[PDB]
Nucleic acid binder design. Structure first.
Ligand SMILES: *Cc1c(COP(=O)(O)O)cnc(C)c1O
Ligand SMILES: *Cc1c(COP(=O)(O)O)cnc(C)c1O
Ligand SMILES: *Cc1c(COP(=O)(O)O)cnc(C)c1O
Ligand SMILES: *Cc1c(COP(=O)(O)O)cnc(C)c1O
Lengths: 441, 441, 443, 443
RNA sequence: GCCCGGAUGAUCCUCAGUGGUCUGGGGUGCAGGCCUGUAGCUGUCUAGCGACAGAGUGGUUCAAUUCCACCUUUCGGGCGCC
């Protein structure tokens, strides 16, 4: 009976709800998971069910792959409530949220008040935030939104039933940045009462850079306007998390959203809503109708308990290193072809190399390069050609994917995101070169 | 090389996208699943990723438990679009939707036009429907809603940012039913233009019964008002599915929603949106911002391929049998205590036994019985006491859980839902008796 | 809330107290909780672990570690396959328990007087060999093993591998059946002398038309001449007839050990066996004759299985085999008529059946050998086809009329058996595919 | 889209063509695709299946079927553990391949001249026994096995289980080391006569202060007197020193077979071994001496492992063991000084180290025996403690000064070894816990 | 079992024919005076009355029983000499 050392790791978790510093062994992890699962009624031995929702499972494969967690999280009114029918799942939800909160502090935002995991995409998660704000601000019709050419967060505003006010970005050197004048101009033109919130974005593709959060946080605190931050994959960026921390300090940040897959290397499908006003975060929680999947929370729990805060820190560290490596490698490859690495110092995660030497009109070289890269099995390589027209839920974007009507050149994206390895870079550079050379002939 | 017999089962699936009549063996199933998984870029061998979302997975346990399906379903604009980054997942989504459509026909609604799985609860899934309708009907403020005391679908209307018009139910014998007069009275009072849609419910707890769908479908077709059906767990009920089929025939049904767990015995977290106008169903699909989890679609795929349409039919058949068995068993137990089985012929799934012999005021017997049942490990047993006051998102319900301000008596719920076994019933009856006897002393 | 575990613990504590099969099969949840609880008792899985030995339990592949529920150290110590291993308390405990359940099953199955038994991670043939190896030291003058013929290479070679010379006693034709030639056995005990005989090696489960050896008679011959008696019960645990017969032998004569296969009697993967006896002492001797540690895989497999089925589970399987043996039989009768063949009368075989194939010309159309592969390509396994005049050499010994258990059986025949786990669909598929197979030959 | 499979197929086709370890480890996805592809080739997994046999591959527990990747039929046929099984083409193929990878690894590891080898689902001790069993038939007059002493019950008992009488040749003290007494061996060949000797049984991998037997010298003695030579290479595959030594013996003398454990050399669960030789012929003879079918579990485990590690993977492990052996050593030196003990000089052992424990009074404070369990409760496995004057009886033979490999070794000592898979944390944890363990005894 | 094609799967049964709201040959059960009129199914709702759908899955096409793919079944052909 030295299972006391497992008991001890577990007792420590339940007591302080923080990430283990060093990862648990699978043995401890699975032991724990089973102790939880058997607390859910559907797994009770002496159990009869006479309800419509009893966690009955027809496939052994399904039961096993979810570690016998079938009931989901929350009750009918609360995606945060305890349900005597699934005591184990309820406890699971509480812990994983706590672990997440811990990581969010450790990642940069130490003054985060509260947060919760929600089994939706980042897009829908933002929508939930807008749906919640509507009730707090019934006269509001518009969301003010510093442009970013990513369909999910844009659509999120329309799905919620509000009208986006696209605030274009100001070009500074090579970087696209927040037009603080225009924002404050609009809030005045439309009037704060009519503004649902300011919807800013941190993580994004170069040449766009993380919005001027603190400046916006002030505009928001001043005019009493809610500030929601799309931090889709900014948790892995101490620069990004710092911005959030700061804006909340000198100003107002009502909620920030991040994606589970982009920040924690788990399957697509979950997100985190986080804030500094505890009461308001829970209002968003309460806005969710019915129970939700536990699958994303389970993945997060498993990943974090397995990595430990140390494991996570390591990854964050490697990410930075890979960023330099990638940047420096692109500078070199870039030279050999008379292109350059766009000067985007303020973007911690994403880089862009120019493609001015390829002409997209005579022959479709810039487009052609996109396909070649794909067929050569290079994912994430994002070619951005000049002058793309595109409609998204009625609104028409000029020069779409460039984040502004008329950017100087066509370029190509790459990023050091969490999990990336040197091989990723070397193979990229190796294959990008091969593609460029191919386009010459 | 007799793997031709596996190839053949699979080729048959892809070709006609129907449920196998008889279940596949795990061997075939897993073979298939792996062939899909390896079509997703993240699983390619010669793959480098330089994006922010590459399906990177830190836990081997996570990767394995999802059969290496990490990318989710859909793209940024479409939870139904193909993504070259996840060809396998995209194909997975298409097939599982097809299988589902097949089951939905086979279950009663043969004239279903289109449907899709969505990684949300039934509550949020309904919300999505309201969020979509808003754009089609910008002047609309209210949803007309024949009362049902279930927090999730009620909240769903408010989360979507609309105002519920609670239409009370008419008592007929022991049954609570649709007040068709009041509905048409309200549509006239408020005016069709101001009505977002009529929100009816089929599956529910006795003594409420499935709404008069066809009659409502007509009111809706007449006044040009959208009709959305909460069919939460009605797929398992040929009576319920028939109603839907019919309403669509003599009238208008724009979309019906069902829950994945309640109808297919998989973990809580997914739902199905289904309709008869193909174009409109896809409009709801397009309304979803960003990618979504594949976890619910994978469970459904696995379950159905494993059961086959035969397996499913068997379950549906057993459900009916269990219903009689349960009903007849309650009639008997009921007698011995001078209670009775409420006369609710029109409710195919749920039964109710009275509890008039226990007085909830002197001693709290009706409440006490609820706890005793729980501690004795009987789930689904739903005690409904008289006169419960309760607020849900501002609105105050009188006699909550009874579905009407003043129902004749206190009663107790039980249901034959899919998956239930005889043991469930016998243990229930055995333990309910034991509890009642206990309350006497 | 942590009282949900109470129900699980009751099931486990009960197992650890009495070591009997649970009457009703366990639930996967309970089973896996238990397995994990055992595995963390093993030193390799300790959290505060450092290893400086050459055998520490290290596992390179997670896949491997997972699939064996983190049981790595195998079973036993260097000295005893019986001894508890300080390094691996969990595996040790797993092993005590598996042997217990298996003993429990053996009684339930017909041999209620069974003294002791153990699982050994070898095939049946190799497990027999182990018995012989143990007997050698008890009988140093012994060179011969007396063996009523049965055409199956493993049990036959088990004797040669052990270092002895098989003395093949030909069978007696009694009606349709092939039975023990008791007079021939005694003749050989006398000719060679008891002191030169290591043991008599008898077989229970086997193919028709052969039937189980006359254990009672042989048990007495052995008692009288003071010769050990080893019984090959390969797949006889599923037969109350076979088991009761073993029990009878032990009651009236001597039976030193009976061996049976794991995969044939418990529907687990090949590779495991049970050695069982009526003298606790002697059984332990064979156990201690095993050199070093052994795989825990076969034990794990039967533990999981027995725990999942429960006494009732296993019993039910046993009943359904009988029911299927009746069915399969009638079906052969019917098919026989239709084709001018017959179901050879072999009442004394509870498992295997034989159908005639006289109407097939193998010396003309070679219809008998060609029907073999026909049943094969058409996906019928277990269907053994037996020609006349097969010659086969096995380790230097040449058999005449091989596969038939005698030099000249009346006719060519076809085997089919009702083994545990067989479902109605199995017979129906067999009968159908055979009818098609025979029609085909006509053309 | 179905071209994503192309990359996977290249890896597989390459494996099936040359049967060499992939240089770089496979990816789980590829590995599992392959395994499933094999398993569906087995008749038990066929879709159109009916079984009427007594051994059909039926599995009662899904758990069991899953954990074995649906490989149920085991390996071989009744005749050969070498023969392809019509019933189980998949398992057959799995087995050919495993043997191939293992052969590949054995060359890479030092014995480049290796003729053939096979995996056998038995322990090393039992696998040795099998070798002996095979030799018996080649040398019917043989009663004795000549064996340079090494205190380990399994390899010792392997000889008795096989039915022979071990002739224990005491070792020679040379410096700190214990080595082969070549003059003593020859004395016994002469006294007993080559014709009475089944074989000489030598050991490579072992505990300090003993070191690997002088294979070269012994290989020649064997060549001259025409005596077979069986080498116990239990955990020597991880040592290029041991392997090169085996290769040398084969070059200048005779070595009939060398046996090695699976779990000790490949970090898989206990229960498997490899029998290897330089005469393809003789190796096949031992293979055919195995009676019946065998478990596929041990083969599966090494296949998965080797396929996952790749040549490079395994090589790296081999390099890191060396590096750790250096480390562990220096660390013992340092600790020795601090405590007035020393690292016994045993340059000829590449794996095991010994530290003195002279400063401990076992006849006064019993400090030596009590430090044994101390290292144990404090969670240090593999740390063997060796007192003076241990007496032990093993199968009737009584050892004096047991565990030390001689009757009177100068001092009490403590073993620690750098076995494959050992990590720096292992040494550090050991050194720390030992320092604490020794401090403790002072009080 | 895998491969190759001829038919077949459910409008009283069987044969024959054929892209047009099916047309013949024969036979059978019930009704009426050889003639003439009708002749079964299953699934869902229903107390019942009765009503509502489905003739393999889909595809071509103004329209298919009648074409084309596939599936169910049944017949024939070749593969099978552990
Ligand atoms: C289950 C159910 C719902 C939806 O509940 P969710 O938790 O959102 O899946 C809605 N209405 C009724 C009557 C239900 O039973
Ligand atoms: C990934 C991402 C989102 C959210 O996308 P989902 O598919 O909804 O998770 C939003 N904005 C940006 C910039 C993103 O990269
Ligand atoms: C491990 C070992 C053996 C064989 O032991 P088994 O448990 O039977 O595998 C033999 N000799 C030595 C030196 C060993 O270390
Ligand atoms: C199966 C069997 C054996 C043993 O075969 P193994 O493959 O070694 O387990 C012995 N005799 C008979 C009659 C058998 O059926």
């Amino acid at each position: 009976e030295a299972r006391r050392s497992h008991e001890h790791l577990i007792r420590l978790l339940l007591e302080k709800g923080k990430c283990p510093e060093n990862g648990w062994d699978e043995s401890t992890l699975e032991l724990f998971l089973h102790e939880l699962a058997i607390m859910d009624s559907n797994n009770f031995l002496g159990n009869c069910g006479v309800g419509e929702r009893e966690g009955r499972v027809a496939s052994a494969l399904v039961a096993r792959r979810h570690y016998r967690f079938i009931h989901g999280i929350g009750r009918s009114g609360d995606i945060s409530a305890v349900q005597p029918k699934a005591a184990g799942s309820s406890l699971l939800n509480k812990i994983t949220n706590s672990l997440v909160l811990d990581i969010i502090k450790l990642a940069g935002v130490h003054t985060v008040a509260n947060c919760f995991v929600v089994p939706m995409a980042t897009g829908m998660s933002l929508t939930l935030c807008f749906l919640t704000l509507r009730h707090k601000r019934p006269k509001a019709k518009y969301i003010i939104w510093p442009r970013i050419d990513q369909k999910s967060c844009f659509k999120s505003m329309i799905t919620a039933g509000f009208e986006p006010v696209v605030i274009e970005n100001v070009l500074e050197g090579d970087e696209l940045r927040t037009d603080l004048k225009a924002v404050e101009a609009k809030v005045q033109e439309l009037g704060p009462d009519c503004i649902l919130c300011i919807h800013s974005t941190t993580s994004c593709f170069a040449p766009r850079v993380p919005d001027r959060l603190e400046e916006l946080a002030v505009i928001c605190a001043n005019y009493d306007i809610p500030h929601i931050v799309n931090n889709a994959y900014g948790v892995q960026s101490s620069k990004c998390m710092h911005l959030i921390q700061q804006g909340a300090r000198v100003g107002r940040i009502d909620a920030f959203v991040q994606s589970l897959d982009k920040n924690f290397m788990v399957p697509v499908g979950g997100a985190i809503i986080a804030g500094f006003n505890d009461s308001f975060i829970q209002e968003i929680s309460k806005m969710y109708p019915g129970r939700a999947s536990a699958s994303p929370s389970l993945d997060v729990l498993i990943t974090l308990l397995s990595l430990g805060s140390n494991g996570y820190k390591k990854l964050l560290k490697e990410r930075k290193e890979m960023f330099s490596y990638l940047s420096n490698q692109i500078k070199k490859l870039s030279e050999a072809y008379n292109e350059r690495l766009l000067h985007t110092p303020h973007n911690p995660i994403s880089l862009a190399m120019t493609l001015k030497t390829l002409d997209e009109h005579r022959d479709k070289a810039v487009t052609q390069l996109g396909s070649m890269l794909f067929t050569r099995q290079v994912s994430g390589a994002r070619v951005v050609p000049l002058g793309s027209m595109q409609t998204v839920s009625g609104y028409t974007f000029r020069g779409f994917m460039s984040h502004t009507n008329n950017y100087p050149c066509a370029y190509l994206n790459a990023a050091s995101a969490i999990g990336m390895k040197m091989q990723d870079v070397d193979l990229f550079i190796k294959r990008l070169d091969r593609c460029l050379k191919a386009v010459r002939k």
